[model samples]
Target: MFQQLSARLQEAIGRLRGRGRITEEDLKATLREIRRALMDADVNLEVARDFVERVREEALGKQVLESLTPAEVILATVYEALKEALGGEARLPVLKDRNLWFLVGLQGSGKTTTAAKLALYYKGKGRRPLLVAADTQRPAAREQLRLLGEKVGVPVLEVMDGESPESIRRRVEEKARLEARDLILVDTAGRLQIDEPLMGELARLKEVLGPDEVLLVLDAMTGQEALSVARAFDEKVGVTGLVLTKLDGDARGGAALSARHVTGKPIYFAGVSEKPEGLEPFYPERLAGRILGM
Candidate 1:
């Protein structure tokens, strides 16, 4: 998706070769390429437009075109804008040796699978995590989580199938505390789409569970649609962070940029596979390099 911009950036910077200075035209050309790249990435049109305009203004206002080499100045400006949109100063989840991490997202967003991945991740790091299947209404959702947890060698808290979600969450909380688990990963229910009923249930879970980190898992294949979903969840339940899934299948990767910009949440981790090893920490620099095919 950012291939064009990456190419343009490489060419523009490569032209500087061994030079130490840049020109106004060089800066303009680089910025134009970047703007085009973001557009291609399926970033919300308005956000891309506003971002480019601001970067342009900042590039010119700071005399970046006059002081540094064309490539250096361009890279600096892009990095700054990217860092800003990437939620500068944001922190990753600590897991605290013993804390709760609540996973929330729509149906088919891979919450059940991700819960297993997370359990494996923490266990490898020497922390004991308990997976809470909080979606009691889904016929086999709890079983799905339990199966994955079993495969990962982590404990899964599966309550009675007919109980309310709140009751399931309460049981999990008590178990987590009693067992002194390092982390409690609650896998909540998901809807096919955002609706009042779905939101109301999630809100109640948030109020009762009071998760240290309420991660909103989203499918990256949705592109711009993912951004809207993230906004809806944030407005409804107050998401603390994001977890993007299916990025390996997403060539555009627009949802990454869109979610970061719209929800102002740091993506804590990503789901790249269906296996327990699918999850990985979110790294903007690495993702940027990937976008550029570096």
Candidate 2:
């Protein structure tokens, strides 16, 4: 996945590696070409522009002209810009802190499954985590959460039929406290599409739960729409971070490249596959290294 964008970006930067004397116009052309490549990858126009602008600033702001290694200097500049475009550093949800994470997303985003994956991850980290089945719209989702939680030996709680979001919060809070769980992960009902009632329900839950993180689960395959979706959710229910799913199936990586830059939210995790163990903490530096032809 991200093969084409990776190849194109590498090819663009690869051109400057051994250039003995690159003129200012040459650098401009190269940056333009890089921006074009990013646009080809469905990167947001503003992000691509800002990225190129930053790289150029960094390149000229330093003493690159006085140095003998113009290419290497420019390379480092691009690398820095790329890393900043991706969030500069990885931000992990702090352990020993009461992290009530409410997972929300549009349908088919693998939100429910991602919930399980998170439980497994923290379980391995030895955090007492509880998976809450808050998807009141689907009974199957409730059962799925239980099955996955059981498989991981992490406890699951469900918001039963006839329970208000507030009511469920009371029950979930009590259960977590009783079980000595420090992390509470709530999987909410996926929106079929962005709709009023559903958004309202999620907002209501957010207020009742008062989650430390309202993580928006995004599917990489959604392409350019991902940024808008992130903004819409943040506008209505509020979003703290992101979990990008289906990255294994996406070759363009439009969302992965532009989500953070466009939405101003850190991508907390990236899902490589559908399995419980396919999740990993997203590192901007690593992804930037890959994008910069590591």
Candidate 3:
């Protein structure tokens, strides 16, 4: 992620590598290039502005100006600021006791597939996870989730025809208790966009299940629109974390940077590939370094 921005940032920052001392004018030009790079990558205008301002403050501070390796100091400052912008520390899902995670997002954001992937992830960690196909709106959603569950060797709780959301919630809860499952992954219905009915249904599920984590699955390729969706979902139902999908695709990588900054949510996992084993925990420092092309 942030591949394009990484290259741009590297080019902009690389100019200082051999310089003995960076003048104020030189630093200003570099910051301008960094800001332009972020904007070109579709970062939110305000987020990019704030990030640049923070970098500027640190770059102008005594620590960087007096350092023997001033360029290294400035680069480290940028990395730290980027990490903070991308949610400083990872807030992983609570795995203790009975954990229920509701995966919500737009229709084509890969929520169902991500649910299965998450189940597989926890399963590999020796935790028994049950997948609930609560997406009754689309006829194929249940079948798709069921197929994924079978492929991953995890049990799936299917929703019957005309099954109410409450009923599905109860069934999943009972089944999890019966099966002694530690984690319950609920794949909720999604719409083409953020709509009242969609949010209302998710809200009802949240109310009924009291999910430990309301993770909004997002498509990274959506760019700025992904941030808007994250905001809409957080404002409506309150998201605890995020799951970004299709990171392996031709994503420009702005969504990953902007989503958490805009919604104040940590990205717990990122879908790096299409396989079930593709989900990986998000490390802000690693991503920050990658963005700087380190």
Candidate 4:
């Protein structure tokens, strides 16, 4: 977990409480803590090392100690670095007048559950949403979507067992247009790991659906490998953003940090609990605090 980083950051910043001005030695101490925090977050060894190196250089290079409140100055520098590493503030993908969105992920990665949570989020804003059960291959996946959709008060588009996911996507698109739905959330099928068939299926759907947004769903508990998974999906399907699931159980928050940097995608939302209402928007500050145990 990020306990080490959080503890280090807490201790590092605590020293500045009584100081009116920051000194080079003080800044160095704090930066050292930050470096340790990131490394302990399970950031890729090389990436973590380079990240700290760059921050140190930039922190010292900018003569940050000269600032009136060097603590704030250092925090700003860290924030900027994080922003850059986090794909520079997540932007929602462009939507047609209808504002459709899509969710994709590997099996057991919580795509269907996430789709339901997202529907609730949009519904809270007073927009009507329709869930498309595009995952026809996964056993009970369609039923799962339907059940979750019902719980969330959103309509779900159903396809026959024999229907290909592509056909399902087309039908959903047509339905969304015909019904003037605010958003059509298509939940795609997933495999245990990234593979050609799975990747090709998603790519074909993206080409056909031309969705307003294609979100990649992931599990933060997956840890270091989360970065590789993210990169693979992004490369094959061109994800617009990310949705990390099962954060309720993920204390490390390593996957969050690694995925952001590896895929260069904004984490648009997060799944914090089993309850739909527990879904939370991605806030870097809150996440930073969690990562640092603040």
Which stretch of 10 consecutive residues in model 4 shows the poorest summed lDDT? 285-294
How much is the lDDT of residue 45 in candidate 1? 73
- lDDT string, candidate 1, 155-213, tens digits: 99876766775687678867877987878888888878888886887788788777899
TM-score of each: 0.85, 0.92, 0.94, 0.84
- How do the residues 176-278 of candidate 2 rate in per-residue lDDT, one tens digit apiece? 8888999999998886688888788889889888988888898888886876788888999889899999888887877887887788888999998877799
Q: What digit string (tens of lDDT, one per residue) describes model 3 on residues 139-244?
A: 6889999999999999999888667878887788799988899999988888787789768877877888888989899888888777677777877788998998
lDDT of 4 by residue, 242-280 (tens): 888887777566777677657777888888888888677
Off by over 4 Å in 4: 1-4, 16-29, 61-73, 289-294
Ranking of all candidate structures by their TM-score, best first: 3, 2, 1, 4
Give the lowest summed-lDDT range of ten residues in model 3: 62-71
lDDT of each: 0.75, 0.83, 0.83, 0.73
How close to the true structure is residue 286 of candidate 2, measured as C-alpha lDDT?
91
Error of 1 at 70 (Å): 1.4
> How much is the lDDT of residue 170 in candidate 4?
72
